Design a protein around this ligand. Structure first.
Ligand SMILES: [Zn+2]
Ligand SMILES: [Zn+2]
Ligand SMILES: [Zn+2]
Ligand SMILES: [Zn+2]
Ligand SMILES: [Zn+2]
Ligand SMILES: [Zn+2]
Lengths: 347, 346, 347, 347
């Protein structure tokens, strides 16, 4: 028996308290799916949704956050055909779409005007039971633990989509800015899974961490005077691709500076008040392409999922209770993002 | 027949001034080819040859300017296979290349470390007889007036390469900034050849010229305070691709502003002191691609040349001598608006 | 005598052709003053409040616009010190200010945090009786035409302060972009009143107009190919000052190009999504200063009205009713010239 | 004790290898003065003189470079009325001026048309004996170390002049971008010497150096995602002035972003391919002024030197031989300085 009440984390207003409180269990729409989310991931966007910094409008309306959730389908709608009860499903950033849009008929559904967003426009994965469109829902393979898939739902798909947006060939050099973070570690693992020579740029103790994951090179801004020259000496002309994972505005310009001739620099993050200038003369002469990578489509999601399923990508995670999620948000204000943290909805 | 003197313009060092004086005939390289230039075009990169301002080291030694030139092959070198004597050929920006470099083997020769640039590292098109690599040369079909071919070798090719860097499908809307200029008059026509709905942004009443080159709609900076708003209103969300021919920094920033989501913004020129900012947030959300377009490849060259051959492109041009071409040149140090300027040796 | 219902133009909605409508006469403020406005001016900023274009949010409440109003005080209001019934007064863009801010003690009141703006924050001059703070209200001299003082309330003070911000010496060259516009004609007359050599830049048949205003020579973007070179030729190295009235971005960048070494380029307009780049090399070597001029101080206001009273400044206007002012609103979004407009409240 | 031959570092061609040659000692003009240059500073401007990248032309191609030199006067010309042999003298970037130009009467000699520039048009301080105009030469006090005064001749005077162009009062906040560089350290010390509150923006926490120089707050691009917001928090609305030493483009637009209302943003360097855009709306509403500071005037130079004399400003330096100067030129064509290099023209 589907329950009638659940535990969720709800903030009524921007900046307001997250509440571990009892709320009604959602009942699914005709095209939706009801998922007992057992584990949910926390990316930093949830703090930006809470702050309201994005020009977009959060539902507020007592919103439950979350865009990365793994669970089991417990109820299906009337017009849902391909899903069966007991299947594993994922709540992604793209909750639903119009599906007959210019952007929706293309391969990129999240850029539709009538997009429904988990944790922004719709109640997200921080609750025990969540509703998601069956068409945009994730097919998670049985025989892998949902705890490990939860970070893949946003971080794995995004970093994989960025590497694919680089249009890089096997053997080329890819540079990962901010490679010591969780997103960066996943970028390193995915790039090695695509047969790419990996160069890693970040400040601090990450020199050991990247090699822990297999990264072929690491560079420290703390010790290295000019990143451009050092990178271009280690890559013999610049990296064929650059992934700007750090949101600091200076690594973006450095990436644009040290990228190889005909190289591709992709922005991945969604930061505020950050701009990347570049000399038109050098952009034309080197024919570099600055590409923006948004959230991936279902096909990219399925690829990224298969990478973890086959064992190419493994991200260590710290499991925390839904009650303790409040503390987690505090860490995000202080930039204490700890690897990848996943929440057990039961606790 | 060949002469032993050829009327060209050479500097001895940086900062010196030209002259029409006949100079010794350049020997042919073994893979090179000697072409008698019948007509030659003039772009501002030749204006940038002087003063040594471009960061890439230049032939401070004696150097002949000029890059775009159409003429007849009078002789070749030791090893050449596909060329026949008497054929019509064109010299472009890329004179020769490493031919086995990473960037040269990929298919993009202009990007080698050992690139030869006509009018920078070899004698250009401002001479009567010039030597250029046969593998990087133009192949002109007979029956086409050379006066009209000269602008295709540089401006037409650059416009075609820019339009193909947009990766636009038949039917999308393309916005061209600086469409009243020569680069602009050419891009509107090349875009119309692709089945592209053309939107043009230029200042003044160069509109009628645009509109009647086949463009759907025209936008005027004088009239509009916000080009972005009008452009996004006329295209229903922004153009799928934007080609930046104007070098003003504002059109660059506007191009990134009014471009459609999943759009393609292309830089074309070799502009000094130009910078294109873009907010990372909107580039990521719109999944925008800001790409830089350099010279076209041999295949792109032939596509543009065949567009000239088949009658889809029509270009106004103006014939003046090499002997009598420092007036228009200095006028252009002041960026004199000049119809395509071709150089008839005679 | 003073009615209880008045004719006015109010757009409760941002984007509505606002209807000539009867509204309640405003309740007199405690320290404020009630002014029967007999003539009111129309500036392009009035359109932007209607458009909702400005990042600064206008009053989401019923707003009757206007920042330039000339009238007679019909009720004095409490906490007023020197205002007397029968005095002539002017409603400015700055309706009131905190008067005890870091910037308010600095002598520049419009940059206070608690600033109230006529036609934006408080009900403006398009109504029969309007409320304004006594300290920022204009002292218009009795015996002087109200129709003609109305345009000075926004254009005269602003262009005069811009010329003050050019910090130009007697005999120096000033170049005025958009000199044929409403702002521009006043700029030419004020600059000639301060002993400056006027150069005028505008498109079309306006050359005789500007030269009749006292402009020494005229340059036309329509006929002249390169404005920078021609201006530098007319001035022997560039104008000592430039005033950018047109919001077109081309003249702003050209102004930074052709301004003389050690020159001063002053921005005046309030445009949308328009940026001014400048080559760091050339701005440093030429030591040019790009300075922005916002609303004038009370001292600047009285200086400009002094110019009008003594006859140095003459404004041309077509007196129109409040009716058919929606025609001119459409004309302003139409990107089109119609001439300076002053409205008689009676009609 | 004047021989007829000296040691100098000369390059006959742009890009030529500089040579430690013996060359004839220059013959002093009647209005010139001959200074045994004992110490000479090396800033990146000399490297741009060598490259010929600047739009101007080192027209002396047979050229000994150098714009900052400290030495003893060993000979004067016929028209040198007030200088004495044994006095200390400084070779500044501005070697001489016409003294009858508009810009020369205004007090700004470097913007003269007939200006001769040390290390560019006239032989500079890289030689043992150098010639400089007696009117434009710097008066260094006897009893001060020439090695330490030499960097003030270019860095100290320039940062002092920029801080002067800010026209800031005692107690206001000034923000220094690139505060960890040599220019940055000098401006921090000068700004403290004028009674300002210094805020410093640069890379690394090793910049406790800035806190030692007197900077009141410091912000790190590494740690802080958005510098603008944090700076405005630390200054309660933005710094009253900004001094842009870094030529990176993003810091220049960021400086324009976070500068307080009615503030002054000053550009200082002479970079290539650098440009500062700014939104006209915010420049007008905030009345921000983007001003460029070129080299200082003689009054500015003596004001700056008095400060070193009194001990408020100190420039740690690495002393290198005149022979080794080629190494210094080699590094700067590649990347920035590791410190203020000064040449003992004895070695
Ligand atoms: Zn996320
Ligand atoms: Zn859609
Ligand atoms: Zn060309
Ligand atoms: Zn090659
Ligand atoms: Zn220096
Ligand atoms: Zn002078």
């Amino acid at each position: 028996p589907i329950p009638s009440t659940q535990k969720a984390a709800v903030f009524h207003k921007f900046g307001q308290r997250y509440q571990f409180e009892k709320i009604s269990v959602p009942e699914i729409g005709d095209d939706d799916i009801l998922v007992k989310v057992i584990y949910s991931g926390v990316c930093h966007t949830d703090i930006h949704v809470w702050l309201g910094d994005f020009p977009m409008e959060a539902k507020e309306l007592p919103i439950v956050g979350g865009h990365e959730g793994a669970g089991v389908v417990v109820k299906v709608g009337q017009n849902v055909k391909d899903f069966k009860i007991g299947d594993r499903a994922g709540i992604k950033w793209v909750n639903s779409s119009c599906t007959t849009c210019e952007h929706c008929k293309k391969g990129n559904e999240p850029n539709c005007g009538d997009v429904v967003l988990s944790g922004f426009h719709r109640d997200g994965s921080f609750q025990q039971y969540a509703v998601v469109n069956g068409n945009e829902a994730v097919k998670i393979v049985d025989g892998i633990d949902l705890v490990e898939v939860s970070p893949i739902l946003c971080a794995g798909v995004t970093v994989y989509k960025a590497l694919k947006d680089c249009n890089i060939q096997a053997g080329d050099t890819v540079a990962i800015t901010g490679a010591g973070g969780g997103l960066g570690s996943l970028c390193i693992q995915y790039a090695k899974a695509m047969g790419l020579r990996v160069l890693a740029v970040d400040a601090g103790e990450k020199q050991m961490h990247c090699r822990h994951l297999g990264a072929d090179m690491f560079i420290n801004p703390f010790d290295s005077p000019n990143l451009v020259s050092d990178i271009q000496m280690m890559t013999q002309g610049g990296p064929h691709g650059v992934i700007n994972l750090a949101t600091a505005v200076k690594p973006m310009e450095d990436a644009t500076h040290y990228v190889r001739t005909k190289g591709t620099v992709v922005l991945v993050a969604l930061p505020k008040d950050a701009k990347v200038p570049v000399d038109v003369f050098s952009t034309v002469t080197r024919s570099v392409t600055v590409k923006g990578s948004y959230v991936g489509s279902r096909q990219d999601t399925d690829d990224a999922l298969k990478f973890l399923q086959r064992g190419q990508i493994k991200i260590p995670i710290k499991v925390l209770p839904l009650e303790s999620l409040t503390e987690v948000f505090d860490n995000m204000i202080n930039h204490q993002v700890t690897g990848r943290v996943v929440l057990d909805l039961w606790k």
